C-alpha cells in the first residue's frame, strides 16, 4: 500500500499525458485501495461546471468540494445542493469575490478566453486560496491545445499586519497537438510544478490580492518561459540527436 | 474482472516510454500483485512491446545487431536475422537472443534484399548516431515486398531523458513500378525539469519506378533519405511555430498593451 502508492504515482508520471483520465481510471480499477490517494495527488485536467443560479462557469478542485458537491464562487452555493456545506466566513467571502473578479481580469488579459475561479479558506494566522485557470484551444482540425493551471497560496500576516508571508505552489499542465502535412502528427503533453515564498508589504495601496496577483503573474510568466524551453527546446534537441540530416563525421 | 485486470496490466506495459520498460513493468508487477496472472495474459504484451519498438539485439558472434519486429517473427518464439541468414530464439523478458541456427530463406527476393540492406546500412551509419536497421524480402499476399526497418535511440536516465526514432518502409515491387508505404515515428520523454512527452508519427504512401536490384536500391535510399529529411526539417519548423504562435494562443507572454498588469487599478 505504501509502496503500491509509490508505484502508482511513478507509473502515472511515465504513461501518456493525453490519457490521464482513462489511465487513472484504469489504475483505480486495479488498486481501489489507493483511489482517494490517487485522485488528490495525481495531476488531472480541470473540469468546468455551470452555476445554475447565474449561468456562469466555474472550475472544480478539492478546495471547493464538500462530499460530492462543489461550491460556486459566483452564487456561493453547493451543487448538488447541501443543507450545511462548508462556507467561508462573511469577511473571507468578501475577499474571495474581490479575488475572483481580479483574477478574471488577469485571465482576460493574458489568456483572452478560458475560465478562472478562486476559492479561499481560513487558517490560524491568515488564510489560503486556490486560483484555477483553464484555457482550451478548439477551432481547428490541424492545431489543438489546452492550458490548465492551479496555484495554491498560503498567507501569513506579520508585523501587526503591515507585511505578510506568501507561499505559492503552482502546477501548469500543457498539451499541444498539430496535424500537418510535413511534420505529420505531433503531440506534446506534460506539466511543471514550482514553489515560491516572499514577504511583501501589506497596505492600503498594496493589499493582499494585489500581492497575490503579482506573485501568480510572475510565477506563470516564469513557468511559461520554462515550458517554452522544455517543450520546444529540450525535446527538439533530443529529436535532433536521434537523427542527423548532415552526415555524421568520422 | 481478473481477466480485466490483466488486460489493464498489459495495456500499461505496452505503453511504457522507450527506455522505461523495466520501471513500468516493476510498477505494474507490484500493483497487480499476482505474479501468476502476470505471466499468463501479459506475455503477449512483452512480445508486442518488443516488436512495436523495433528492439535492437546483439547476437553473440555477429557484429551487427538485428531488430525484433513483426516482420522477422517466424512464430514459436523464433526471429529471423535476414542479413546473417540465421534464426534465433528471443526471450522477450530478458531481451536475450539464443540458439542461433542457419536459415536459408528461399532466395526469391534475396538479391534485392541484400542490395537494399547494403545501401541502408551505409545510410543509417551516416544519419543515425546509434542506429540499427534490418531489411526483409518477403512475399505478402502474392506480391514481392522489401521491408526496411530503422531504429535509433538514446537512453540517458542520469540526465532524466530518453528518445527513440523508428521508421518502417515497405516497397511492394511490381516491375517496372513499386508502391511505397512508410511510417516514421518519434518518441521523447524529458523529466529533468518538469515532465514532457513528444509522440509523433507521419504516414507516407507513394509510387516510384524500379529497374535492376543495385540501381533500384540506390534510389530507394535517396527516396528514404529525402523523405526522412523532410519530416525532420518540418518537425523543427513546427517547433518554432508552436513556440511563437500556438503557445501564445493559449497564454500570451504579455497582455496586448505589453505591460505587466497594474494590480491596484484592477482593485
Author numbering:
A (entry chain B): 2 to 251
B (entry chain A): 9 to 275
Paper text:
The actin capping protein (CP) specifically binds to the barbed end of actin filaments with a high affinity and prevents the addition and loss of the monomers at this dynamic end. CP is a heterodimeric protein composed of α- and β-subunits and the molecule displays a pseudo two-fold symmetry due to the resemblance of the tertiary structures between the two subunits. CP caps the filament with its two independent actin binding sites at the C-terminus of each subunit (“tentacles”). V-1 and CARMIL proteins directly bind to CP and inhibit the filament capping activity of CP.
To gain insight into the structural basis for the inhibition of CP by V-1, we solved the crystal structure of CP (chicken α1/β1) in complex with V-1 (human). Three conserved basic residues in the CP α-subunit, Lys256, Arg260, and Arg266, were shown to be critical for the barbed end capping. Arg260, the center of the “basic triad,” forms a bidentate salt bridge with V-1 Asp44. In addition, Lys256 and Arg266 form salt bridges with V-1 Glu78. In V-1, Trp8 on the V-1 helix 1 inserts its indole ring into a hydrophobic pocket, which is formed by CP (α) Ala257 and Leu258, immediately adjacent to the “basic triad,” and CP (β) Gly138 and Ile144 in “loop S5–S6” (a loop connecting β-strands 5 and 6 of the β-subunit). This unambiguously demonstrated the collision of a major part of the V-1 molecule with the filament, mainly with subdomain 3 of the penultimate protomer. The structure also indicates that V-1 lacks uncapping activity, because the V-1 binding site on CP is buried deeply between the two end protomers when CP caps the filaments.
